[PDB]
Amino acid sequence: TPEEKLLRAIFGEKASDVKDSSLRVPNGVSGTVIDVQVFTRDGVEKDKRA
């Protein structure tokens, strides 16, 4: 229904069909994070970590 997206646009509360696709660590491998790089496409606004 096109009415629910209007409500989603009215308030800042998140509402969507969220699927987990996060980058996880493979099994067996381990280590300590020593460097993190972030590349953002032009035009898109940067985030806090970036």
Q: Which residue ranges make up the site for another protein (CB under 8 A)?
A: 1-8, 10-16, 18
Q: Which two tokens stand for residue 32?
A: 């300590």
| Rounded Cα distance, 19 and 14, in Å | 14
- The least distance separating another protein from the CB of residue 20, rounded to whole angstroms, comes to 12
Figure out which of the listed residues 1, 6, 38, 41 binds RNA, where binding follows CB under 7 A: 6
The option from another protein, RNA, none interacting with 47 (CB < 5 to 8 A, set by class) reads: none
Of residues 3 and 35, the one with the C-beta less far from another protein: 3
- Residue 50 vs residues 25, 26, 29, 36, 45: alpha-carbon distances, Å: 21, 25, 26, 10, 10
